[PDB]
Amino acid sequence: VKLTAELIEQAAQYTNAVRDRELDLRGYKIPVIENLGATLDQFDAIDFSDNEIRKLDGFPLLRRLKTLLVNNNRICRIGEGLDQALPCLTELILTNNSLVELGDLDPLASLKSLTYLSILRNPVTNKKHYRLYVIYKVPQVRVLDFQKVKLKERQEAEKMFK
Amino acid sequence: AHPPELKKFMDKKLSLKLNGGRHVQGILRGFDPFMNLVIDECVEMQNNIGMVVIRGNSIIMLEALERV
Amino acid sequence: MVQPINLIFRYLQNRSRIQVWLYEQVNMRIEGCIIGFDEYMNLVLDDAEEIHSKTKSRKQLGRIMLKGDNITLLQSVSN
Amino acid sequence: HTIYINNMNDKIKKEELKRSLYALFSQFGHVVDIVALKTMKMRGQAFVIFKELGSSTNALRQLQGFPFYGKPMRIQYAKTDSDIISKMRGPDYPPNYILFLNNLPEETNEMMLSMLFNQFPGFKEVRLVPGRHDIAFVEFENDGQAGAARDALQGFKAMKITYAK
Amino acid sequence: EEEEFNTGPLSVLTQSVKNNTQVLINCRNNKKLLGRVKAFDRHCNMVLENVKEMWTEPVNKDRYISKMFLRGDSVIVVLRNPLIA
Amino acid sequence: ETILEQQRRYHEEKERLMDVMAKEMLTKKSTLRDQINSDHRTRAMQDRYMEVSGNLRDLYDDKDGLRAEFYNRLKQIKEFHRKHPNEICVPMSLKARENPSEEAQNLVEFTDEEGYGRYLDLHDCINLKASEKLDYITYLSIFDQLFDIPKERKNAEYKRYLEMLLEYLQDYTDRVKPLQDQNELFFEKKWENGTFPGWPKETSSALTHAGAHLDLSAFSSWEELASLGLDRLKSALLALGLGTLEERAQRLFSTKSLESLDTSLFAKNPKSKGTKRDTERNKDIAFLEAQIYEYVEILGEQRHLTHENVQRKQARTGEEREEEEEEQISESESEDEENIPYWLYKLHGLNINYNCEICGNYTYRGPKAFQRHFAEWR
Amino acid sequence: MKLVRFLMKLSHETVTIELKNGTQVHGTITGVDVSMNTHLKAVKMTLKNREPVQLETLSIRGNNIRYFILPDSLPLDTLLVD
Amino acid sequence: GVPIKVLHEAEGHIVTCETNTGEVYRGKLIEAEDNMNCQMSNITVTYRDGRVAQLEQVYIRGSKIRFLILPDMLKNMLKS
Amino acid sequence: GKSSKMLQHIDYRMRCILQDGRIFIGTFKAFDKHMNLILCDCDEFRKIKPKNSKQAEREEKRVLGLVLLRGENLVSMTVEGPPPKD
Amino acid sequence: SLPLNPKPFLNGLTGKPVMVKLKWGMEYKGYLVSVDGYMNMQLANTEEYIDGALSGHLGEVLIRCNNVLYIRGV
RNA sequence: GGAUUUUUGGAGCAGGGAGCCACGCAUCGACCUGGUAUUGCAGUACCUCCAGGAACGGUGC
């Protein structure tokens, strides 16, 4: 069950609860993110929850995409050119995925508008200094794992890793 | 001499964009063929102004705050 | 359903003091008691006033006929 | 279908609260809508509405006391049905607070069902113990909590729990 | 209709055409057209002769236009006077 | 993630694609032949097959059936080659895991979808056999690239430009055919015998629009040839050659529109304020003119083909022109791959209007018949 | 009386028209219609604060006209007859 | 008018609308009146500053519309 | 008399000028009493209408597609290019 | 008063000193000679008050209807 | 066939100065630090209060 324009064309389309245009891609067992061209850049965010995607990569240039819900997939790596295809990405929900090393979260530093980030229920979470590492390497984030990035944490992350 | 198709919006709360960058909110109580409106419990965007007449001439856009 | 014209007819009968929002001019609004009006929403106002929202200043007019061209909005005031 | 959350940090602006709520709760199923106001009465609270009922029960059990913007949230099943649900959809005791039925064996037991039923402050009666270990009689102080427990394990892969209708 | 052109406010134009007298037209463009009315209509479209157009840019300016047609919407005011004299 | 597996899958996919476009080139050799022929006149070195092969439409021994479809498959192969280039790019850029592979032992699933979903993702041909297009490019449509008057590269529509041209010359003395006669000018004519003055605005603008059109048409009609290669070739020819125009009498012409006695004065003129000004203002136009030139040269066959078409249609009658248009239309919107008792009926109660709602809001002309509807298949 | 009728007679005259948006248009009238929509040929049009552009043809929505400057030669007394 | 018939044809399709003030509304056209009055649903609005918002239900007066973009599904009224 | 002055340019590519000063170029397919216009394959320009501007011809160009423009906001039209054959 | 309409009001004010405000903020004081159906207005011995200050003494004047904001007797 | 959705207009007008950088006036809004109040089952112009911050945003002249 490949991602398809045909798949995308019959997919529930609606205005969500936070007033944004959202496309429902949930629960199709998609393994690879591809063929997004067919959405025609018409959505604020895409719901990819409960699928089998391994890597957050493969996006076309999508200027309107601001929210990506990627819950319960198998994300173990993040693509390197994400800001070049998603310039205004502001919210990224990655709860319950497979990111294991702090260094695998490095590609998120290039998403200049990224403000809401959620990486809960990922092995990487239990790594020593996981929160400070994210704060220093992705300073554009204001809310991390539903907790406010505070000044004291920023300073503390400036010492360690300076 | 057509009517605007607004019966669907009758007695609903609405958000009205007017010319001059002016915005008000209130409940639709009626209309005529010129799209002049009667709006009840109207609020200038906030200060309460009560029941008012809006001339259709100066109506840019309306948005329902309810489900029709 | 209340028709807008009728609301006016009500304003007329009530002799409620009325405040008019003008078209493409925000800094000034007009006030008065509707004595009569016509098919074009042209209004005859009594003891009318120019209201400067910026200057908090009022200009006294007396007997006014305001063309309806200018009408954006019609409201009532307790004063 | 709707969960009532309280004990929320009321300093978060309304639109941010709703967007984080949406994000957090999307992991369990599609959230249809969120009602949250900052009035004195309603501040620190929110109603989260899900398309699927199983999603609401799962959310309730898994996020009970989850630290959100600094405070541990308290979740419960809403007292009434949400207007949106009633419109999308279209007896006197129902909802009832006593669920008796069986079809829940497999070394299952009374301290098991007592802790699962315990999860709920409504934890009142729990009857699961004979050679059976498959007949469950659960008396939950109130149907929000009986409904919470029932909605939490509403498809114990299929068990049969029948309110005392 | 002629009666309304003859006695109503447009009699200003009716009088200017009959007497071949000058009138100053204050105009929407912030310009003023000074001349004689060869013809006019309901909308205050006009065919004008010997038009002196005057405006400002501060610097005053003017220019002569023998023959021209004015679309009447641009009219603000039309003035009759002891101007022709 | 073991890179070995990834690089493996990459080489495998590349293999799959090569195999696909090779199968294509196999069923209808024209696909390559066509392409190659054009390539021949752009990069002179290119070796091309024996003419006999081309004609008989054969690659070795078997002569294949002659085939909109050719172009289609060429664009499909185009996207395929794009994929391939991408994969090639990314590619250029034990007990531990075997233990974790034990994860979730109990799944009742058949897994036959890695090479089959790919092989399938790139193969010919709907349920069975309706659309030649592969799943890879299932939403590929030529009609969104070619207009009806172009007939997938058969002709180029220049009527529009004849219109704009009339608008440019500010008259009507110019006919479609005289306009084409003008186009023909485009190595020296378009430069020394210009339709209009080459410093005219309207003219330069027109020339720009037209040039752009011809170029896009060119690459549109020959997907299979590397566009970037051609572009760069032309650009380098422009920079390195284009005192390329030399006369034994007047010397060296400059696209300043002046000649020059010797190469010496020509060189010391390329630094002068005049030439700096001009080359700094009219650069884009000169370059566009040049492109129009070389692209029109590469399309000589299409230019001629169209001019011919024009003369034909022109010499038609009404009915003829109409039927021809019908033909162009059909070619445009066609699949790329083909598979008395008057009082008797009143007395008997028939031919009276009636309707059944449950059946397609159907109409019945008789009451006996509708009473028979109650027992029916539908 | 209806002065648009007068303008409709001016086919093949060359005029200068000043627009409401300040633009200046000089060309030869091919047609004026009842809405004062005006069509021209051999047109030199100068938008306010540009150098002129030449157009073989230009079509103006009537309402956007401020005024026409007519040929000095024009025999108005003839044209005003119906 | 011929354009009006083509507008009514776009009812039920996704369309884009710019107002006289340059706000840009994209969504499903529910109803189009003769005078160009437009009822739409599930809108994305893009203001003059660039910011976006989302609306469920809107209705815009015909006079205060500058233009509309319709699908290309319609392009195929060629008689006129 | 003839009514043709619009009908002539029908099917042609046309350069239309808006009241704010935008340039809409599309295929002129239909009009009406108000001069509401139907423009196929329509693009919008802001900065320039090129007459072969040596620097570039095209800045702030936007692809729109099938456009219906209201006549209220139309100022003028000129012929931009001939009809596409399609 | 028992309903006093636009039209009669203006007709009562003919023969009288009036001042008209225009939308553009100019003001014109003079004797109202006449008005017509479209509410075009004819003043005699007109004076111009701009910024509320006497600017120009103008004489006989036609004001196009669309320019008028309001009319006052004075 | 000039009186609210098109063709007889609500248009018209106002920005450089100082040494690549920075900017007058008025109104409204979130907004950011601290601290502090509320534990309330809803369908919403906004939503605790107290002090400090605005090299913030929009509109008009």
From Swiss-Prot, chain B:
Keyword RNA-binding part of the UniProt annotation: yes
Gene name linked to the record: SNRPG
Database matches in Pfam families: LSM (PF01423)
Family, similarity comment: Belongs to the snRNP Sm proteins family.
GO biological process, one term: 7-methylguanosine cap hypermethylation
Classification via SUPFAM superfamilies: Sm-like ribonucleoproteins
Function: Plays a role in pre-mRNA splicing as a core component of the spliceosomal U1, U2, U4 and U5 small nuclear ribonucleoproteins (snRNPs), the building blocks of the spliceosome. Component of both the pre-catalytic spliceosome B complex and activated spliceosome C complexes. As a component of the minor spliceosome, involved in the splicing of U12-type introns in pre-mRNAs. As part of the U7 snRNP it is involved in histone 3'-end processing.
Location in or out of the cell: Cytoplasm, Cytosol; Nucleus
Protein name as annotated: Small nuclear ribonucleoprotein G
Oligomeric form and interacting partners: Core component of the spliceosomal U1, U2, U4 and U5 small nuclear ribonucleoproteins (snRNPs), the building blocks of the spliceosome. Most spliceosomal snRNPs contain a common set of Sm proteins, SNRPB, SNRPD1, SNRPD2, SNRPD3, SNRPE, SNRPF and SNRPG that assemble in a heptameric protein ring on the Sm site of the small nuclear RNA to form the core snRNP. Component of the U1 snRNP. The U1 snRNP is composed of the U1 snRNA and the 7 core Sm proteins SNRPB, SNRPD1, SNRPD2, SNRPD3, SNRPE, SNRPF and SNRPG, and at least three U1 snRNP-specific proteins SNRNP70/U1-70K, SNRPA/U1-A and SNRPC/U1-C.
Organism whose genome encodes this protein: Homo sapiens
PROSITE patterns: SM (PS52002)
From Swiss-Prot, chain H:
GO CC terms: catalytic step 2 spliceosome; commitment complex; cytosol; methylosome; nuclear body; nucleoplasm; nucleus; pICln-Sm protein complex
BP term (GO), one: RNA splicing
A molecular function (GO) term: U7 snRNA binding
UniProt KW keywords: Acetylation, Cytoplasm, Methylation, mRNA processing, mRNA splicing, Nucleus, Repeat, Ribonucleoprotein, RNA-binding, Spliceosome
The keyword Ribonucleoprotein is annotated on this UniProt entry: yes
Chief localization: cytoplasm
PTM (free text): Methylated on arginine residues by PRMT5 and PRMT7; probable asymmetric dimethylation which is required for assembly and biogenesis of snRNPs.
Subcellular location: Cytoplasm, Cytosol; Nucleus
Residues covered by the Sm domain: 2-74
Function: Plays a role in pre-mRNA splicing as a core component of the spliceosomal U1, U2, U4 and U5 small nuclear ribonucleoproteins (snRNPs), the building blocks of the spliceosome. Component of both the pre-catalytic spliceosome B complex and activated spliceosome C complexes. As a component of the minor spliceosome, involved in the splicing of U12-type introns in pre-mRNAs. As part of the U7 snRNP it is involved in histone pre-mRNA 3'-end processing.
Miscellaneous comment as given in the Swiss-Prot or TrEMBL entry: In the autoimmune disease systemic lupus erythematosus, antinuclear antibodies are developed with Sm specificity.
Family affiliation: Belongs to the snRNP core protein family.
Official protein name in the record: Small nuclear ribonucleoprotein Sm D3
Parent-protein residues present: 4 to 85 of 126
Swiss-Prot record, chain I:
Location(s), subcellular: Cytoplasm, Cytosol; Nucleus
GO biological process, one term: protein methylation
Keywords: Cytoplasm, Disease variant, Intellectual disability, Methylation, mRNA processing, mRNA splicing, Nucleus, Repeat, Ribonucleoprotein, RNA-binding, Spliceosome
Disulfide bond annotation, renumbered to this chain: none
Any single GO CC term annotated in Swiss-Prot or TrEMBL for this entry: U2-type catalytic step 2 spliceosome
Post-translational modification: Methylated by PRMT5.
All copies of domain Sm, residue ranges: 1-83
Note: Patients with the autoimmune disease systemic lupus erythematosus (SLE) have autoantibodies directed against some of the individual snRNP polypeptides. The most common autoantigen is called Sm. B/b' bear Sm epitopes.
Clinical condition linked: Cerebrocostomandibular syndrome: A syndrome characterized by severe micrognathia, rib defects ranging from a few dorsal rib segments to complete absence of ossification, and intellectual disability.
Annotated function: Plays a role in pre-mRNA splicing as a core component of the spliceosomal U1, U2, U4 and U5 small nuclear ribonucleoproteins (snRNPs), the building blocks of the spliceosome. Component of both the pre-catalytic spliceosome B complex and activated spliceosome C complexes. As a component of the minor spliceosome, involved in the splicing of U12-type introns in pre-mRNAs. As part of the U7 snRNP it is involved in histone pre-mRNA 3'-end processing.
Name this polypeptide is given: Small nuclear ribonucleoprotein-associated proteins B and B'
This protein's encoding gene: SNRPB
UniProtKB/Swiss-Prot annotation, chain J:
Quaternary organization: Core component of the spliceosomal U1, U2, U4 and U5 small nuclear ribonucleoproteins (snRNPs), the building blocks of the spliceosome. Most spliceosomal snRNPs contain a common set of Sm proteins, SNRPB, SNRPD1, SNRPD2, SNRPD3, SNRPE, SNRPF and SNRPG that assemble in a heptameric protein ring on the Sm site of the small nuclear RNA to form the core snRNP. Component of the U1 snRNP. The U1 snRNP is composed of the U1 snRNA and the 7 core Sm proteins SNRPB, SNRPD1, SNRPD2, SNRPD3, SNRPE, SNRPF and SNRPG, and at least three U1 snRNP-specific proteins SNRNP70/U1-70K, SNRPA/U1-A and SNRPC/U1-C.
UniProt-recorded name of the protein: Small nuclear ribonucleoprotein F
GO biological process: 7-methylguanosine cap hypermethylation; mRNA splicing, via spliceosome; RNA splicing; spliceosomal snRNP assembly; U2-type prespliceosome assembly
InterPro entries found in the cross-reference section: Lsm6/sSmF, LSM_dom_sf, Sm, Sm_dom_euk/arc, Sm_F
Gene3D superfamilies: 2.30.30.100
PTM-bearing positions, type N-acetylserine: 1
Compartments in which it is found: Cytoplasm, Cytosol; Nucleus
Any Pfam family the entry gives: LSM
Principal subcellular localisation of the protein: cytoplasm
SUPFAM superfamilies on file: Sm-like ribonucleoproteins
Key words, A-Z: Acetylation, Cytoplasm, mRNA processing, mRNA splicing, Nucleus, Ribonucleoprotein, RNA-binding, Spliceosome
Family annotation (PANTHER family): SMALL NUCLEAR RIBONUCLEOPROTEIN F (PTHR11021:SF0), SMALL NUCLEAR RIBONUCLEOPROTEIN F SNRNP-F (PTHR11021)
GO molecular function per UniProt: RNA binding
A GO term from the CC aspect: U2-type catalytic step 2 spliceosome
SMART domains: Sm
Disulfide bridge map: none
Family assignment from sequence similarity: Belongs to the snRNP Sm proteins family. SmF/LSm6 subfamily.
Residue ranges constituting the Sm domain according to the UniProt record: 5-74
